[PDB]
Ligand binder design. Structure first.
Ligand SMILES: O=[N+]([O-])c1ccc(O[C@@H]2O[C@H](CO)[C@H](O)[C@H](O)[C@H]2O)cc1
Ligand SMILES: O=[N+]([O-])c1ccc(O[C@@H]2O[C@H](CO)[C@H](O)[C@H](O)[C@H]2O)cc1
Ligand SMILES: O=[N+]([O-])c1ccc(O[C@@H]2O[C@H](CO)[C@H](O)[C@H](O)[C@H]2O)cc1
Lengths: 133, 15, 14, 133, 17, 133, 133, 16
């Protein structure tokens, strides 16, 4: 897997990801807010292709993510993130992928997700989130 | 809202 | 150091 | 003056300013750190020329500012920032510009300056600083 | 316009909704 | 259940909780640090007795929690926190309770847990954590 | 003098200080907010007495300090804090003390003073402030 | 790290 680390920004304007219902999450790229202007993050791509792209365009700054959840499971011998859901204060986006395996969830009562880091090989192996006020 | 906040000190200089 | 820090939670997935 | 606001970043790599000892600070521009990379801030220029340029290139991230000080005073009828000094954990840069009028100083015991905002006409009218851990 | 109460990040809840 | 909210502090010195190996977590209490002094949190008690107490005494400030994990699930037809495990930089405490139901985990790469809030009825119904640098 | 350090809290409810119009600032004590309840800070007293006491009772949480200013200078051969003024979003309190020597000022555009540290001998020798969101 | 939360601190103003 290639490690990635976007670092921290001011907020999130858009999430671009891709998935395959045969397998798991493939690619991941965020358009951040940086001091009220868009900042297009690096595009973190799988080693393989064939995934279905999705674009989550948030109504920034009024709309923001309150919970990220998903499932981890084994795909072809790799334990990876198979599904993601993004719940905002407005709507739920997802699940994307295959909702099968071990669940995880990060609900936020106060604060914002301001950045992502993680590792992508064939699929999204794992990820972390920067949180700020 | 969706915008992260930071401490700001100042201003020094003119009103 | 000169690098600002922030809370990081995770990883999830493995 | 024309207001500017660079916003907040991860740190400071270089400060470019100009000054005239007969008057005050003129231009102001910062190269920030943004998650490990240089971010070239917009150049906030005086409406006039005739200033001496200064570039303060810090050994980021080993070197960081621990105190900003200066003087405000009247120049041609306007209260402006006449002088600036930047002390780091390695060295002191300045004073730049005339060290006369009302002193001010912001020593930092813990934390970092991560952004600037202010206003520049003929001279730097005023400024503020974003601080973070 | 801030109030005079300092804010902190809070994650959760886990458990009953 | 009865809600509780300890607020936010400087760090964690000790956690005193009770649990039953057939049901879930019961009582919960924390000794925080507050600017170098122990702050004895209120003891948040189950409505029922019969739990086993455990005292997790951390070597503050060099020892701190890196991950809280556990399970949520049905007891007596209520969704409750059935188990908790606290992993620090020095060792793992738990699991306490019953490791059955839906797993959750909050691993921390950077930052500190500085406060707990939640609700306890017969069992710990839910909880959240204040995080800070 | 005797160094003091209150550390950091949730906000400020009241400042008690004392001063003499011929010398400098004497005593200093803050009633902080800690998670929505008062927390009575330590009373940092001068080694001498006879100062005039001042109580600044803020309308917490809506009234908060936006600028602390004052003057440093010489009293009996020691550099001390001769004067303090506290400006809130609603009112100004001060100056207290003697307004001569070198001025200083901390205006805050965003964030809060949540704690004080410093040193007091016969008079307030120096002080620093904790800032948070 | 350590287990102690930190905060921005500005100052000191005065002696020393
Ligand atoms: O008397 N002048 O040559 C003179 C004329 C116009 C000037 O512009 C003035 O710059 C000022 C100081 O930076 C303020 O920004 C003021 O708002 C701006 O109009 C400043 C000086
Ligand atoms: O009594 C019960 O205990 C339950 C499980 O802990 C819930 O707290 C419920 O609200 C309470 O009435
Ligand atoms: O005026 N005096 O005789 C006089 C006597 C003792 C004094 O004590 C002095 O207070 C100073 C200012 O607060 C410093 O804290 C110094 O450390 C302390 O010894 C200061 C002045």
């Amino acid at each position: 897997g290639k490690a990635f680390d976007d670092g921290a920004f001011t907020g999130i304007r858009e999430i671009n990801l891709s998935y395959n219902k045969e397998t798991a999450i493939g690619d991941f790229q965020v358009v951040y807010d940086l001091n009220g202007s868009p900042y297009v993050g690096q595009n973190h791509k799988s080693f393989i292709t064939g995934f279905t792209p999705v674009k989550i365009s948030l109504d920034f700054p009024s709309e923001y993510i309150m919970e990220v959840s998903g499932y981890t499971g084994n795909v072809s011998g790799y334990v990876v993130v198979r599904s993601l859901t993004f719940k905002t204060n407005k709507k739920t986006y997802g699940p994307y992928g295959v909702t099968s395996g071990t669940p995880f969830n990060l609900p936020i009562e106060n604060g914002l997700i301001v950045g992502f880091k993680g590792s992508i090989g064939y699929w999204l192996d794992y990820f972390s989130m920067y949180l700020s006020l | 809202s969706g915008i992260s906040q930071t401490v700001i000190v100042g201003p020094w200089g003119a009103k």
